Design a protein around this nucleic acid. Sequence first.
DNA 1: AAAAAGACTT
DNA 2: CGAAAAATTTTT
DNA 3: AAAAATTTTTCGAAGTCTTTTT
Length: 565
Amino acid sequence: QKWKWWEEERYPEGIKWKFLEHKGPVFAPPYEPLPENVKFYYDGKVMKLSPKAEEVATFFAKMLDHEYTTKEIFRKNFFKDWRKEMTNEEKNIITNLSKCDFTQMSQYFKAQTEARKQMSKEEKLKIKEENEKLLKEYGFCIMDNHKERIANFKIEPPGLFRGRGNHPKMGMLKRRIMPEDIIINCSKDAKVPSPPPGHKWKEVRHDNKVTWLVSWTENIQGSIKYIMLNPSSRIKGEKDWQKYETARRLKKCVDKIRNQYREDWKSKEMKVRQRAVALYFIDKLALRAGNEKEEGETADTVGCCSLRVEHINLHPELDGQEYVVEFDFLGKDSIRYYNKVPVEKRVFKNLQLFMENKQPEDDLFDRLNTGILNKHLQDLMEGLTAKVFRTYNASITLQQQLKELTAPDENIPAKILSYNRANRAVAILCNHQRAPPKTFEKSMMNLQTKIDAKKEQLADARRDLKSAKADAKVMKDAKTKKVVESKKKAVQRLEEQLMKLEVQATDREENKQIALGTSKLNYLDPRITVAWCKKWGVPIEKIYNKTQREKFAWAIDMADEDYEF
DNA sequence: AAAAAGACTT
DNA sequence: CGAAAAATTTTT
DNA sequence: AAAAATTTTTCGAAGTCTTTTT
Ligand SMILES: COc1cc2c[nH+]c3c(c2cc1OC)Cc1cc2c(cc1-3)OCO2
């Protein structure tokens, strides 16, 4: 089509659409039972299970490979939830989990998977084709004059929850989502989608102030899950753009706030002193303002405002630095945040005051929570909140570091390295860690062997040139002195090759325990990127793949080479 | 308020 | 997402 | 061709902030 929505006038705040029509959500493929020969054993005696329970048994049989299926919490929860999905001959016989034998089911599944990567184009293409009849019928919805794409219209299948980290609910069954759980949201003038035969949707609402197409209540933590639009849409873009534009507004008066909190580290009231120290951490250390959460329903992890006392430790002078805080805690997605950080004299003397006669299990910031912090932030700048501090620090660091890295002289894949090194700088700030792929890091030897090979191809292009400079001394004609210029051009064509290969070796190494994923799509103004690519002639696709190009299709078209965040 | 939902964001 | 799978692509 | 290191998809939750209810 080619729809420039960024040129259109905005929508009067709070009203999100006028028209919304979609063929609804796609359900999970119905459960296909086990064939006779894949028997299940309880107490060593052959037991055949009812479809409800057998379904729940496969979920466990498939995860057997994992170390977590031995964890107490996991076996406790799972089993409690399996008993429930069992009949009475079964709730009588199957007393504990530990006496059931899934090994046969488990092996059948490892077989089906290996005997899937073995079908030829005769059966393989027939699936990739049937899937395309689907993405077309259910994957696009019409929202106000335009056919826009839906994110993940395919509803999540029932399995067992595991979640990240030490989740208290790990093991609990994720119930299959029936149409009687689904609320559809469309316009009054839209052709309301038809439910699967023999079912009704939970509600057909026309709430035009929301951007969601379908919503149901999932049951592990009782949170409301949704089916929203593709990031390439208007309803997701206007928004993302607003967010970077709000990140830019914070820049105009960032120094002003960094002056007031610097002075607020004095204040007569203790409660203002907290709200200021917290603000420093979020600013200079890019911390998620930690909202509090229900104990026993989430993995114990925290952010800034929820920082318990046991999570921070003081040190006056360590490893040569003056006035340091030894940060150690589990942040979002249970990823660790270890950092020895040198603060200002006041702040250190201010943290001591916050820990003074307090128990390890208690809050560092008493009578402070994210609500209070955001209330202040909102007074400071219209529309401000605490994530903007991570978006700004992320963006302003990508742009300023591209200026400090990208050299005019350098070739095209070297710019990519200078860029990736800037991207990296954000990821270390934002604590966007990654764990090096499971024993797949011997592929550093099989990328370095390609280099200690290209060094030999070029070793000899020089040794071949050194013969031509001993032949251009005795006999200096049109077919000698010009045969050197084609043997030096050959050293050059292989230099620019070895260089690309070696630049792509340190871009892989420095990035072994760092994830640039999140910062690329979620933090970082894409215009900062487009500006740079238009400026140094690096073709856009060398930085952004297709879904990233699609999401960022508003920036690509808009920003000039001169754009400055 | 201030818990508890809901709706976005990462 | 980003680690894990499926679909590819290079290496052997 | 067949193993081997890839590049692309699929999968499986946890945050922030805002708006409601009790
Ligand atoms: C960092 O950025 C993103 C991080 C994510 C992390 N986890 C999940 C999603 C994400 C989407 C992001 O950006 C768009 C979508 C999602 C769906 C799920 C789920 C986990 C996640 O468990 C069941 O269904």
